[PDB]
Design a protein around this ligand. Sequence first.
Ligand code: HEM
Ligand SMILES: O=C1N[C@@H](Cc2c[nH]c3ccc(F)cc23)C(=O)N2CCC[C@@H]12
Ligand SMILES: O=C1N[C@@H](Cc2c[nH]c3ccc(F)cc23)C(=O)N2CCC[C@@H]12
Ligand SMILES: [Ca+2]
Length: 390
Amino acid sequence: LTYPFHDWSQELSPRYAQLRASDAPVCPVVSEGTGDPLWLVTRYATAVKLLEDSRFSSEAAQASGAPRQSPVELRAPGTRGDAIAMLREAGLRSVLADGLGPRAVRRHQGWINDLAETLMSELASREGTFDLAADFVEPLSSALVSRTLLGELSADERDLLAHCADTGLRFCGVTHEEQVHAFTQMHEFFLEHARRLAGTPGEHLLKLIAEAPLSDEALAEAGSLLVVAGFPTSSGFLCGALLTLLRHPDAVQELHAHPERVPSAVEELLRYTPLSTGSVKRMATEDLEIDGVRIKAGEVVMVSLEAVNHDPDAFEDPDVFRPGREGPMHFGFGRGRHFCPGNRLARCVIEATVRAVARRPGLRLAVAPEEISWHEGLFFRRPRAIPATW
Ligand code: HEM
Ligand SMILES: O=C1N[C@@H](Cc2c[nH]c3ccc(F)cc23)C(=O)N2CCC[C@@H]12
Ligand SMILES: O=C1N[C@@H](Cc2c[nH]c3ccc(F)cc23)C(=O)N2CCC[C@@H]12
Ligand SMILES: [Ca+2]
């Protein structure tokens, strides 16, 4: 069985449920991209055990030379590629909390909600249809990255970074050397500009890092991290969440009537809406055992968050979008020590988007869901456009 399963749209591959129901708690696959053997976990209970055992190491699975699911290493050649580790290493946990935590949300939620309303209001004033991907998600996610993470970017700089992320974070669709060069271009951009970006107005995280008590190569790796972790993820997820909402007008109607139910809908979108077409992954740093299956030192085990989020043993009717369902914690931000530190800002922008939609009932797709076209091969699913109208 080769990996990934080429399920580039919101329709999850049937392989995930087939492995979930199989008689083994971990299943062998082979990387289509490298030929590397890998282990794959699809059950919630097993995923909790793996992701909360620190002897399964994320950094070891990211290291140059690890068995891997990507066709190329996710780093500019000659660089370390372990930015968030390096930053927590140098003693910046405090600064990451300031730039990503509840205080950052308090600083930014005002303009984020103003911008979501402004973008939706301009679309509502247009005669004709519009594109929720290009006209709502792209400006909102670009503003999030610029104001809270990198600093003010020109349009051309934003486009270059967006292109680098779409070219480098891929299972297929580009040559290996094009994929590698995307990381080289991004790194060389931040070698030239990361310090410049820190010296602009704002409280964006890259400034906070650059002002804390770092070499240009380290600051450049911080910039590349914020692009790959913050830009295609937020844009892919907001696009997918809008598709989910547009396909559930009864749910939107309930949020319109009961705005206090929006936070529950945000959490259910994170469970229900698929994002990555690959898996979180960890290297066994010694011989380990998971639900009876031996994992030798150096072997890499992946967890599909999509598969876990749709596990019927965890969630009753897992394929139903049900805000306010009462089951366990979703896996949309992961689990354990590597739980997405962007979760506060992500939840902020997701909530701003849900509220903007819930205030304007009647918003609908201008084509059929099957006429939606998907970028093929991205790590993080994204439709090419979302034609919509009132
Ligand atoms: C402001 C935007 C975001 C920022 C700055 C951000 C930042 C990060 C960083 C730095 C990590 C690495 C943590 C580590 O390896 O210890 C991470 C992990 C993660 N992020 Fe985000 N993120 C953002 C948005 C998102 C979104 C929108 C999603 C999902 C919808 C998401 C899902 C995840 C997941 C699942 C992980 C865990 C990966 C793993 O366990 O290996 N992130 N994020
Ligand atoms: O910091 C990291 N953590 C893990 C998981 C992760 C978080 N965000 C991501 C965005 C793209 C991607 F391919 C992987 C990740 C990982 O694999 N990393 C390589 C690139 C960023 C790095
Ligand atoms: O496809 C991928 N997924 C991440 C882990 C992950 C799963 N779901 C996510 C949602 C958001 C995010 F930022 C990261 C992930 C990861 O390690 N990769 C290495 C190569 C493919 C990439
Ligand atoms: Ca190796």
